[PDB]
Amino acid sequence: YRVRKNVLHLTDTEKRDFVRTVLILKEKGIYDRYIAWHGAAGKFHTPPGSDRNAAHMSSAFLPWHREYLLRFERDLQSINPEVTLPYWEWETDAQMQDPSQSQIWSADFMGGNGNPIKDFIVDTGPFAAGRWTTIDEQGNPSGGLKRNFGATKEAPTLPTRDDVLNALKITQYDTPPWDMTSQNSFRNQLEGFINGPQLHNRVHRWVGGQMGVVPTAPNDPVFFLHHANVDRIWAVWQIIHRNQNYQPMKNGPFGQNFRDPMYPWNTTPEDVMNHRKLGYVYDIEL
Amino acid sequence: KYRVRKNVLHLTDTEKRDFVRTVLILKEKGIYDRYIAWHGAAGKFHTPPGSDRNAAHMSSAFLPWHREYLLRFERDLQSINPEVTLPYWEWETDAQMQDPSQSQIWSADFMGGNGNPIKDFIVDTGPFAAGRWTTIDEQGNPSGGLKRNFGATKEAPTLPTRDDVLNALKITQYDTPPWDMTSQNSFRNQLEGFINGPQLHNRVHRWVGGQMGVVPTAPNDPVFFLHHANVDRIWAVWQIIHRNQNYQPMKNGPFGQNFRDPMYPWNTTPEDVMNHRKLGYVYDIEL
Ligand SMILES: CC(=O)N1CCC(Cc2ccc(F)cc2)CC1
Ligand SMILES: CC(=O)N1CCC(Cc2ccc(F)cc2)CC1
Ligand SMILES: [Cu+2]
Ligand SMILES: [Cu+2]
Ligand SMILES: [Cu+2]
Ligand SMILES: [Cu+2]
């Protein structure tokens, strides 16, 4: 009942209402809760000793962020019942010679790249320094939003459309030991550790700035449109592989299994396996 | 009103045994680690960023946060054993003793004893000793055992007394602006222990030492829950005395500190946990 559109197919009002609603949540102090939640899960290892955490590098990577975006979208609609979370189709932006000139990086939406003159501090758009305060790992002020498109050796370019399709061809959702080293795994493949960095992981490194590391990534509002696309690819995969379900169903590390509570919530992957059941849908399904 | 919360000294041998085992079950399942993480995560959620106030401490939300914290915890106990309830450690009566480190609460059948100076004060007695109990650090990585150092600090060589508790109950205002560590004439700040600190709640932490000495790793010691159960009790008693004194601020305080503001990392508000009886439990001193 709640359509989630593509950024390029948004009206000027839809772009305006979305941005404005985010700034309100920021002013209310609700936005910082999500920044903290994301960082808090990143240090919750399942189990302690492994490199697997509640939100990343394991099987719960996809359902966690789905619930994450869901709650966020719910807080959006508590302000404006018409606003929904759009998605950034970065696989299509890769077609451009220079993706930074895309309409998603316009001054009326997310702003542009960082300014090399000003330590790559974002000085354009509604989320520039002085109009948008960011925090660091410890929860202290950091001094502005940063962005450095394709300035990394491991990720100088965005992933391609072919990368997305090759990921959808995978049969298993995930494979043991449900981590960074999982092979033939759609979860691990979409995350981006298969000959990394790729896809989701590559996009983070590509954007740079706060998006470059896990604990500070949600400081950039593009984080939510990026994962909305990640959530879409997962949704499409479920539609293709109707007979394939979430893995592991159990006996994986606690907090990674199908009926396990996902820190820091009581929500289980089962509770968020069907995005239609959650009350939203993507425009490509219509 | 149906779930009695008793005193550790008033517990049977069976009740102590059942409680301890239940804690060990939650630990093995991986549920216990959630609370350690929750506590540490709120300690770095500053309200607002820049200030010394966090979601769980050094502010007005200190008391309702831990009440909800203990509430959720007590519920996870009953998911295992529906008869087990969370006891409280009356540290004010232990202060009466010549040596508090001799309380029956520090016996091998409950919480174990003090730390071993030979092995960096690692606990080697009780059900939560090294090898029977794994602990984690700030970053969420294994730390290698529980520590305890009773009264080894200059600013907290002794536990707080009954008079400290009484004098705190004599305070009229729940809290005062700027609703933080420097609040004066505040029951919250008093009971927390920043008034000539460390005192009361804060002093107990520093007294026990080890993981209990710092905020992010404090829940690694199961005594953390019996300690805050006593802190919650004193708060409950204060509410009974001053029935028309309510939570402050009702508004205009930092977000997450107000009466109807969600307490990170939950959606629970101080209003939702203002009446402990409505939460489904009571303390034995009320009967
Ligand atoms: C490939 C690589 O080493 N990285 C490490 C950094 C990481 C960044 C990141 C940030 C937030 C997330 F929720 C997930 C991942 C991307 C993958
Ligand atoms: C007085 C003092 O400086 N402290 C700092 C250390 C702190 C310990 C502590 C641990 C966990 C809590 F939930 C609350 C408090 C007690 C107060
Ligand atoms: Cu994430
Ligand atoms: Cu991400
Ligand atoms: Cu605490
Ligand atoms: Cu405490």
Automatic annotation (TrEMBL), chain A:
GO molecular function annotations of the record: metal ion binding; oxidoreductase activity
Tyrosinase copper-binding domain residues are 56-73, 220-231
Where, if anywhere, are coiled coils annotated?
none
Binding-site positions, Cu(2+) 2: H38, H56, H65
Q: Which residues are noted in the entry as Zn(2+) 4-binding?
A: H38, H56
Residues given in the record as Zn(2+) 6 binding sites: H45
Question: Any idea which positions bind Cu(2+) 3?
Answer: H200, H204, H227
Write out the residues that bind Zn(2+) 9: E91
Please list the residues that bind Cu(2+) 1. H38, H56
Residues annotated as binding Zn(2+) 7 are: D51
Which residues bind Zn(2+) 8 per the record? E67
What is this protein identified as?
A: Tyrosinase
The opening ranks of the lineage are: Bacteria, Bacillati, Bacillota, Bacilli, Bacillales
